[PDB]
Recover the amino acids of this structure.
């Protein structure tokens, strides 16, 4: 690693995502996804273990076949009414292939098998940047191409994403796999409301990016991969414990806390449409994806595990880790309940 | 979010590649030029649902 | 005194604190000026 | 009488507060019902200025006499 | 109301920038000042409810529960040491501030205009008590206790959100006057039955009813005194007040669809009075006592007589006082001997000579001694249910017989007859516990003198 | 009998055992590649021709 | 042949008496315990309880009760003087109805 | 409809199934990905030649160069896999299990 | 809902947002934003092991100033968005009187609703 | 799939019997083929004949559940002759749960599947009776 | 602190702080044989700085105030109790051993940071490699359960595999009876209670594994017993040592920058000290750990970030 | 303490759902409940039909 | 005596501030001042107000 090379590759990730955002041409959207891939591969393998090798291999294969299936859908779009305009499509087949390519690219339950495996063997900075930008970049495209999608596609992907991201997570004790299963569940939530009012989807994108930044920042502050290490960081610092409490319960989404606002507003502009059994099923699965948060809390801050010494040694040294931006994102991620009418900040 | 840096900074970096019936370098038409001109002017400032129907 | 050869800080640098207080005073005066201009615009227009 | 004078609030004040809150939230409820009906008919018909997904723009379209006569 | 809200916010940094050996006096003093301030609320009169402007109002049903809550807070705040009076300064301030924030969401929940605000503050009432009982539960299954607690209350309370957003987006806004004054009778579809089942089942979870009553007892016996008294008194009677709000809608269908809930409530009242006649673990008998009285409350709510609502609110407030007191007595006995069981530490008539008078007075207000408010509530509920049906009075008096039986068995079991003369460690009573007793039983008898306050909106 | 053991077998036990079984059958997969791409293949086929999405 | 532990025998019981026989409920600091007893009886009973008793003993006419008493007395005397029977039934005007015909 | 498009899309789907199912080596899978790449190249190029869509004929050569450097990154990853093992098999990847 | 002059680029606040009255000084929402900024500075002093409520006061002043500034701009955008939603709604009501007729308000002397008592 | 669910609900209920049970067997065979496809995609049964045995087992169990479901639906329609009450599909779902418990050879699995399938089949008839939309408005 | 990538771009490399005195020399001997005498001799006759023996309280000696903290916090090691009873079932051998592993690792990281930070080369004594040799010989006497040997092996796997080996190792050989005579001439009775077969097993493993595991990583100089000052021979054999092998030949600049940013913020170094396996001979219950942490906060110089600490300064909290 | 731990928390483990325990639970749990629900149906049918006929003693029956 | 201890005086300041803020809220809700049909008298006799 060189810092010049890393800042240049960060600039290329920024450039690729902005080209995905701004370009009215389909080729440049595909080029933006590809440049995002080509730059995000050496963000992984920041170490040199074979873990990152296998992880970047699996990510590259799924990422590349997603990109090529997107190009397939675009060339079918030009087989029909032929112009390079980001608009309503002209085929249920091309829209079908495009939603499946963006579900492979995004992370979705028939295609979600690569996400926990790729998050197991990478450093936390690489996992943070891949989760944030790879859940950011296709949402702009779906926000653009919404008016020509069969809802069976999006809704089956969303329901299955919420229930599989729930049911995975009870058995996994790696922190990265827990965060990845939470990511699959929240992307199901952010996919479900796409054909109804996408302002909710982009606001939930803002909220979830803030939440993931707080989570992986609070795991950058202490090199922890298991919950036993979280008990040792209970022993060495007390304020990390109450922030794990409040931020994990904000991932849980309880009404005094900021993570309830993306669920609640979705249920609002979901039940002004006359589907009701689908909101109550989704929200029962939202009750389901809180237990692994809860046992994570019970490991960290509300029970007191026995601790190894040399924390006796560590108490001399300061907590001199740098934090990128922890407290701003923390209290923005937890205390954003009474700012409900900031929905209108988006459109 | 489909941003509008394309329209705010004003430099049409991409609008020439986009449709047919643009400024070709040697001024030659495509196969369905007049049909595109009529369809684009039919669905220009229309709300994309009654433009559909 | 009391510290073996290593204070990382403790004597605070004066460029950073002066920069933060200066840009914060700049931001206060800018927001008061912008608010005055907006109230002037509303009371002119209506 | 003294407790009613120095510590409490008048019944006329309470009554006009009730009439004020009912007037305000009656305006709220009627605006909200009109809002949802306007939104649903504007999606169903598209005449309004809201659900206009961006169509083809003709400002880049410039006609000129080409090389081929039948264009 | 905001003048009754903002000194609780300003009471939060009091505990933080009060120094060592000083937080206790300041918190107790200023919470009692808030108790005077809330005693100054009672102004409500005649025709309408009392509006505390647009965000807030109070019926004459929320007012006694609110004054009860802010009176119960200093009682708890003095109750909650000697098991954490030797812990750390920062964690002690965190505990006391969490209790104050819990009170703040209790008052937010009782003073609600819109049911969405009510639901947000309802699960805001939920979240701190979780942390308190899980962290200081003082037994090896407090994990399971808090886990069952939060999962039952969320998994039941969740379709209430969907139903309330539905009533929001089909019939205007959600003022209680404008939920009132406009509600058309919704006829007997099956969707109306599902929506009624959603709202009523969410609050059935919160009461609890008989089918969901094992929610309670672990979350009392594996929980400290503060979370126990807040839990029992304010959370169960808060669920009761929530159903008293929301039952105004859906009148022509609750007649046809409210028969089985009356049924499960009655049979569970009988079986719960039977289950707390034989158990050990003294703390749990009061928990199943609360389950029995809340099943009686649910019978009273789902029949819809003004007599029934007056008896309902009287039974709510009187049982809140009685159960909070009797939990404090069981706490005192456990601080004497660290057993929590029943058959072990008998005697205690010789020693602790005036604590027996408080056990007697608590067990007789649990017995429904007839000038007390408890028998007023139980009596008008029995009157309204005999007007509802001519044969249900056998179940009511059977509850009465077995309730007297287990309450007086609790009295003559643990504190009657013989010291086991191996105990030999207990010291005589402190002034703090007797001060908490005089905090308990003076308001109950003063309400027994003047009970025209606590009867409900259908006075 | 009736309260404790049967009410704990009806409301917690069936739910919690079902969650444990579905977790240990979904997220407990051995880490290969060919099975994941064959799952993608049968997802494409089961979306196109069995229960249609483009029709 | 192992212990799995390193800690003290839990707990270390300290009787709150036997260092201060003049102590109230909590810790052996002799001044602030007297301060607590003074604040709980003066600012908890002596200024709260009896003042609340005098406050709730009399206040305005709750639910307009004695107002309704005197109003009913005047109304019964009024309707006895005007010859019509007290409590005219059909509280809403039977001329003010528009029945759905059949 | 230009019936050749039917057989080219059929060959695309055959290349896609060849990308998905594979048992022995990752190299043949990446090579069938290259074949799928060439399929999209050929189909888009035949359309742009037939329709006389003459201005934006950037597509075949640019799709070519970009997905070729994609294949270059894939070759670098496969060389790293063959470095960190004896072989480059589909198996011997049974660490990092789901 | 969708632009409504996305033609007419993104335009963080348009010039018609000066026609509405601005959010005033000491409005309660920006006061809550300032309280959240103070709590953010306090928890920043709580992450590193410096003494809380002290030795960070320039950071307190900077955080509160920046958050109040950003919240002021967001409140202006919020007010513009709700105002343009109201203007579009009432203009669409004015543009089509045929589609939304008013109810004939029959008084309660002639509204028949059945009774269905409770016993 | 779409055509067989459309021909399921197009037949009135009603006694146009054993066409409905044939449609229910087709429902069960399709769902069993779905589950068998995912299972053979995620197991490596080793060998191929064992995989064919697993697919045949899953498809025959699901087809038998759907068959006895439709049969007791038809019998409840013939006996009670009320086309509205969801108690008939409560009987149907509990019968399907008992057949699932019979073809797994257990007790509590069959009882829990009786409860769940009875409640869900009652909800299916009930939501078709009132009219609850498939997946969407999707309008406003 | 002025560090990070910004300092790496302002000042380009760290190869400018080189070479031929900036080096890692390590004097490894047996207990009371290869000691600070010869270490200070080569330090003052090579122009090169010295680190003391990594004892128990070196973690308290290297930072904060000069006073070593009591053994309720730095302990619970009790080195004299290890020399008294290396058979107590309460657990004293391995807790001491893991504390000494943390001590050796801390002083090794300090030496690497000081070698990178503007020279000028350092000497170590009884390094981490001799530390695992020492514990494996302690297991050759058989005082520790093999489960705990597996634990220490896991610690050795995680920690050691990130660092560069030292440049040279001066091995000192003193026979068993001579160390017996020296420790009898010292006179500490707790230290006099040590046996001789333990020391024999130390020498046997220390010659049988350590010197084969060097293998031109940490190029060696093997010296005899009375070969001591004799400073001319050791200084001159360093001066034409002919550095050939070891992974110091390939950095080139980048591993040096990554090691500078890995050693600093030393909690990065100490993230791998508690793995954990939870070690029934080592771990501590909750209530003892809580009262020990509260008493550690109730030390006057160690509470809440001694850069910002009151009662010493700094009169700048800005009112 | 052994008796209390056997009596309180050793109930639910151990257990197997058998035929006898299931029949006894369904005999003591839903049986008397549906019994009292049938007799409340009976009494409410009688009261509803009687006051729909209007032959009740409600000359003054105020406190309902 | 105020700087001797100021911790004990905080919540009366908070209660007076909340009381004044509720008075300002009721002054902000100053519509329907005399326009009822049940409480309807003229401004009398001094100055143009009937409740604050
Ligand atoms: C139990 C779930 C309750 C969900 C909220 C209440 C509700 O609307 O239930 C009826 C809902 C469905 O009924 P619904 O809400 O569709 O009611 C009919 C409303 N219209 C006529 C507008 C379509 O029931 C379920 O979702 C089944 C459970
Ligand atoms: C009408 C209202 C009905 C309300 C029903 C509520 C759901 C059922 C009860 C939920 C709580 C269950 C629970 O907490 O079970 C305890 C169990 C953990 O117990 P244990 O084995 O001791 O594990 C300790 C760590 N090893 O915990 C588990 O096994 C957790 C398993 C996941 C449960 C999630 C909550 C239910 C989700 C339902 C979705 C449908």
């Amino acid at each position: 690693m060189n810092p010049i090379i890393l800042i240049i590759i960060l600039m290329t990730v920024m450039l690729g995502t902005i080209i995905v955002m701004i370009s009215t041409h389909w080729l440049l959207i595909w080029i933006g996804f590809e440049m995002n891939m080509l730059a995000i591969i050496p963000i992984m393998m920041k170490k040199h273990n074979p873990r990152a090798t296998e992880a970047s291999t699996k990510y590259f294969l799924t990422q590349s076949t997603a990109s090529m299936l997107l190009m397939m859908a675009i060339i079918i779009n030009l087989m029909f009414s032929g112009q390079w305009t980001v608009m309503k499509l002209f085929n249920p087949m091309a829209s079908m292939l495009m939603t499946m390519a963006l579900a492979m690219k995004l992370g979705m339950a028939p295609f979600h098998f690569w996400v926990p495996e790729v998050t197991q063997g990478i450093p936390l900075s690489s996992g943070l940047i891949l989760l944030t930008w790879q859940k950011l970049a296709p949402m702009s495209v779906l926000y653009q191409i919404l008016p020509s999608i069969n809802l069976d596609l999006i809704l089956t992907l969303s329901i299955l994403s919420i229930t599989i991201g729930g049911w995975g997570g009870l058995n996994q004790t790696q922190l990265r796999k827990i965060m990845a299963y939470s990511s699959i569940a929240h992307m199901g939530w952010m996919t479900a409301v796409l054909l109804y009012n996408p302002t909710m989807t982009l606001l939930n994108l803002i909220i979830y990016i803030i939440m993931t930044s707080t989570m992986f920042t609070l795991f950058m502050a202490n090199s922890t991969t298991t919950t036993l290490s979280l008990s040792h960081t209970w022993n060495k610092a007390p304020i990390m414990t109450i922030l794990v409490l409040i931020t994990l319960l904000s991932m849980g989404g309880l009404p005094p806390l900021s993570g309830f606002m993306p669920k609640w507003m979705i249920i609002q502009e979901m039940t002004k449409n006359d589907s009701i059994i689908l909101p109550t099923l989704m929200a029962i699965t939202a009750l389901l994806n809180l237990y692994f948060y809860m046992r994570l809390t019970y490991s960290t801050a509300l029970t007191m595990f026995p601790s190894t010494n040399n924390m006796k040694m560590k108490w001399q040294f300061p907590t001199t880790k740098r934090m990128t931006l922890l407290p701003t994102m923390t209290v923005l991620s937890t205390m954003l309940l009474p700012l409900t009418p900031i929905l209108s900040i988006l459109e | 979010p489909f941003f509008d840096v394309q329209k705010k900074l004003g430099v049409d970096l991409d609008h020439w590649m986009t449709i047919q019936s643009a400024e070709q370098p040697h001024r030659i038409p495509a196969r369905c030029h007049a049909f595109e001109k009529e369809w684009i002017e039919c669905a220009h400032g229309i709300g994309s649902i009654r433009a559909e129907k | 005194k009391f510290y073996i050869q290593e204070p990382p800080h403790g004597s605070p640098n004066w460029l950073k604190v002066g920069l933060t207080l200066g840009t914060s005073a700049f931001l206060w005066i800018y927001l008061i000026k912008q608010h005055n201009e907006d109230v002037l615009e509303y009371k002119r227009r209506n | 009488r003294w407790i009613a004078r120095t510590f409490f609030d008048a019944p006329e004040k309470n009554y006009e507060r009730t009439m004020a809150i009912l007037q305000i939230e009656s305006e709220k409820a009627e605006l909200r019902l009109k809002e949802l009906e306007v939104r649903r008919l504007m999606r169903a018909k598209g005449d309004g200025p809201w659900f206009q997904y961006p169509t083809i723009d003709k400002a880049l379209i410039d006609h000129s006499p080409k090389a081929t006569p039948d264009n | 109301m905001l003048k009754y809200i903002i000194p609780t916010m300003m009471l939060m940094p009091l505990t933080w920038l009060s120094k060592n050996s000083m937080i206790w006096i300041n918190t107790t003093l200023h919470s009692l000042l808030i108790s005077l301030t809330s005693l100054l609320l009672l102004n409500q009169f005649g025709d309408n409810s009392l509006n505390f402007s647009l965000t807030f109002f109070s019926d004459s049903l929320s007012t006694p529960l609110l004054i009860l809550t802010m009176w119960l807070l200093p009682l708890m705040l003095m109750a909650s040491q000697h098991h954490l009076s030797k812990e750390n300064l920062a964690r002690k301030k965190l505990f006391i501030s969490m209790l104050i924030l819990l009170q703040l969401f209790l008052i937010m929940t009782f003073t609600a205009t819109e049911l969405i605000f009510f639901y947000i503050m309802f699960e805001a009432t939920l979240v701190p008590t979780l942390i308190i009982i899980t962290r200081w539960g003082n037994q090896t299954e407090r994990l399971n206790a808090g886990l069952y607690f939060l999962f039952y209350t969320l998994a039941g309370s969740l379709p209430l959100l969907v139903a309330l957003i539905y009533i929001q987006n089909t019939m205007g806004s959600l003022n209680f006057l404008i939920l009132q004054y406009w509600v058309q009778p919704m006829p007997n579809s099956w969707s109306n039955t599902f929506m009624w089942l959603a709202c009523m089942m969410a609050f059935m979870v919160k009461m609890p009813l008989y089918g969901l009553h094992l929610w309670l007892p672990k979350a009392h016996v594996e929980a400290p005194i503060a979370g126990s008294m807040v839990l029992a008194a304010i959370l169960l009677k808060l669920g009761g007040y929530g159903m008293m709000r929301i039952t105004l809608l859906l009148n022509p269908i609750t007649d046809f669809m409210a028969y089985p809930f009356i049924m499960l409530s009655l049979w569970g009242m009988i079986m719960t009075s039977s289950i707390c006649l034989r158990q050990t673990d003294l703390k749990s008998l009061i928990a199943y006592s609360s389950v029995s009285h809340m099943a009686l409350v649910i019978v009273a709510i789902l029949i819809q007589t003004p007599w029934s609502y007056m008896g309902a609110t009287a039974l709510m407030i009187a049982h809140g006082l009685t159960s909070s007191m009797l939990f404090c007595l069981a706490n005192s006995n456990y601080e004497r001997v660290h057993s929590r069981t029943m058959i072990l530490a008998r005697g205690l008539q010789t020693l602790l000579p005036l604590m027996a008078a408080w056990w007697l007075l608590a067990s007789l207000t649990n017995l429904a001694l007839p000038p007390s408010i408890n028998l007023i509530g139980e009596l008008f509920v029995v009157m309204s249910t005999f007007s509802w049906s001519n044969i249900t009075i056998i179940l009511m008096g059977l509850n009465m017989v077995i309730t007297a039986l287990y309450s007086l068995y609790m009295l003559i079991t643990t504190q009657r007859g013989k010291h086991t003369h191996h105990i030999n460690n207990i010291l005589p009573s402190f002034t703090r516990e007797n001060a908490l007793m005089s905090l308990h039983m003076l308001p109950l008898l003063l309400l027994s003198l003047n009970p025209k306050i606590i009867l409900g909106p259908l006075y | 009998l009736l309260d404790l053991i049967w009410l704990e077998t009806i409301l917690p036990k069936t739910i919690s055992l079902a969650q444990m079984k579905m977790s240990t059958t979904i997220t407990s997969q051995k880490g290969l590649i060919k099975l994941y791409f064959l799952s993608f293949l049968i997802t494409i086929l089961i979306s196109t021709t069995l229960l249609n999405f483009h029709e | 042949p192992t212990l799995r532990w390193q800690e003290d025998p839990e707990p270390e019981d300290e009787n709150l008496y036997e260092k201060n026989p003049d102590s109230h409920g909590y810790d052996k600091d002799p001044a602030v315990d007297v301060w607590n007893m003074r604040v709980v009886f003066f600012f908890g009973f002596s200024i709260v309880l009896v003042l609340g008793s005098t406050f709730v003993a009399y206040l305005p006419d709750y639910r307009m009760q004695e107002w309704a008493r005197r109003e009913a007395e005047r109304l019964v005397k009024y309707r006895e003087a005007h010859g019509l029977p007290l409590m005219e039934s059909n509280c809403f005007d039977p001329s003010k109805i528009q029945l759905p015909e059949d | 409809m230009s019936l050749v498009y039917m057989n080219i899309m059929m060959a695309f789907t055959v290349s896609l199934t060849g990308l998905l199912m594979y048992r022995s080596h990752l190299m043949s899978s990446l090579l069938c990905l290259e074949g799928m790449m060439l399929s999209l190249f050929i189909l888009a190029t035949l359309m742009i030649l037939n329709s006389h869509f003459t201005l934006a004929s950037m597509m075949p050569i640019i799709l070519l160069v970009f997905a070729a450097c994609e294949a270059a990154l894939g070759l670098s990853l496969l060389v790293m896999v063959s470095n960190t093992y004896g072989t480059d098999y589909v198996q011997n990847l049974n660490l990092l299990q789901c | 809902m969708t632009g409504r002059q996305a033609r007419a680029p993104l335009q963080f606040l348009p010039d018609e947002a000066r026609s509405l009255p601005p959010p005033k000084l000491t409005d309660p929402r920006l006061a809550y934003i300032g309280f959240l900024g103070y709590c953010s500075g306090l928890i920043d002093n709580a992450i590193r092991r410096r003494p809380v409520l002290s030795a960070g006061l320039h950071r307190q002043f900077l955080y509160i100033t920046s958050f109040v500034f950003v919240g002021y701009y967001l409140l202006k955008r919020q007010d513009y968005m709700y105002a343009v939603r109201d203007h579009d709604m009432f203009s669409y009501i004015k543009s089509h009187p045929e589609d939304f007729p008013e109810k004939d308000k029959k008084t309660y002397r002639e509204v028949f609703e059945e009774f269905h008592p409770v016993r | 799939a779409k055509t067989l669910l459309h021909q399921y609900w197009d037949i009135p209920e009603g006694t146009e019997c054993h066409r409905k049970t044939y449609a229910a067997t087709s429902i069960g065979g399709a769902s069993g083929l779905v589950v068998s496809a995912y299972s053979v995609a995620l197991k490596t049964p080793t060998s191929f004949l064992e995989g064919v045995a697993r697919t045949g087992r899953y498809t025959f169990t699901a087809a038998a559940i759907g068959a006895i479901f439709g049969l007791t639906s038809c019998i409840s329609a013939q006996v009670r002759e009320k086309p509205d009450d969801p108690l008939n599909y409560l009987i149907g779902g509990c019968a399907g749960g008992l057949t699932l418990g019979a073809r797994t050879r257990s007790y509590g699995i069959g009882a829990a599947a009786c409860a769940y399938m009875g409640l869900t089949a009652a909800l299916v008839k009930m939501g078709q009776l009132e009219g609850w939309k498939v997946f969407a408005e999707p309008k406003v | 602190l002025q560090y990070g990538p910004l300092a790496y771009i302002l000042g380009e490399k760290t190869t400018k702080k080189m070479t031929e005195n900036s080096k890692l020399i390590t004097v490894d001997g047996n207990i009371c044989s290869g000691k600070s005498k010869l270490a200070k001799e080569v330090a003052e006759k090579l122009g090169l700085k010295h680190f003391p023996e990594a004892g128990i309280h070196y973690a308290d000696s290297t930072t904060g105030d000069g006073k070593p903290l009591p053994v309720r916090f730095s302990g619970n090691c009790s080195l004299e109790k290890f020399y008294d009873d290396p058979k107590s079932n309460d657990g004293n051998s391995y807790r001491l051993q893991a504390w000494l592993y943390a001590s050796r690792l801390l002083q090794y990281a300090d030496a690497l940071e000081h070698l990178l930070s503007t020279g000028q080369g350092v000497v170590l004594e009884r390094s981490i490699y001799s530390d695992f040799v020492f514990l494996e010989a302690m297991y050759r006497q058989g005082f520790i359960r093999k489960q705990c040997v597996d634990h220490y092996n896991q610690v050795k796997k995680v920690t050691v595999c990130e660092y560069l080996p030292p440049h040279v190792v001066i091995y000192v050989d003193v026979p068993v009876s001579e160390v017996q005579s020296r420790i009898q001439k010292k006179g500490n009775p707790h230290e006099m209670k040590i046996t001789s077969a333990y020391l024999q097993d130390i020498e046997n493993v220390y010659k049988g594994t350590f010197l084969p595991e060097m293998s031109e990583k940490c190029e060696v100089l093997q010296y005899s017993a009375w070969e001591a000052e004799d400073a001319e021979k050791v200084v001159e054999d360093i001066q034409y040592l002919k550095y050939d092998k070891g992974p110091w030949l390939d950095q080139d600049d980048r591993k040096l920058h990554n090691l500078r940013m890995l050693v600093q913020d030393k909690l990065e170094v100490l993230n791998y000290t508690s793995i954990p396996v939870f070690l029934p001979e080592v771990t501590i219950g909750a209530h003892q750990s809580d009262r020990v942490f509260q008493e550690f906060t109730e030390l006057p110089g160690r509470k809440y970030r001694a850069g910002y600490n009151e009662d010493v300064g700094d009169k700048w909290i800005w009112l | 303490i052994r008796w209390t731990c056997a009596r309180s928390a050793n109930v639910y483990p151990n257990f197997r759902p058998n035929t006898k325990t299931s029949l006894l639970g369904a005999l003591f749990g839903i049986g008397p409940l549906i019994f009292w629900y049938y007799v409340f149906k009976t009494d409410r049918d009688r009261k509803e039909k009687l006051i729909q006929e209007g032959k009740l003693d409600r000359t003054f029956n105020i406190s309902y | 005596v105020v700087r001797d201890h100021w911790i004990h005086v905080l919540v009366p300041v908070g209660f007076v501030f909340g009381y004044y803020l509720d008075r300002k809220n009721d002054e902000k809700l100053a519509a329907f001042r005399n326009k009822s049909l049940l409480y309807k008298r003229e401004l009398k006799p001094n100055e143009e107000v009937t409740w604050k």
About this structure: Residues 30-46 of chain G form the longest helix (17 residues). Residues 17-102 of chain G form one domain. Residues 70 and 76 of chain G are 10 Å apart (CA to CA).
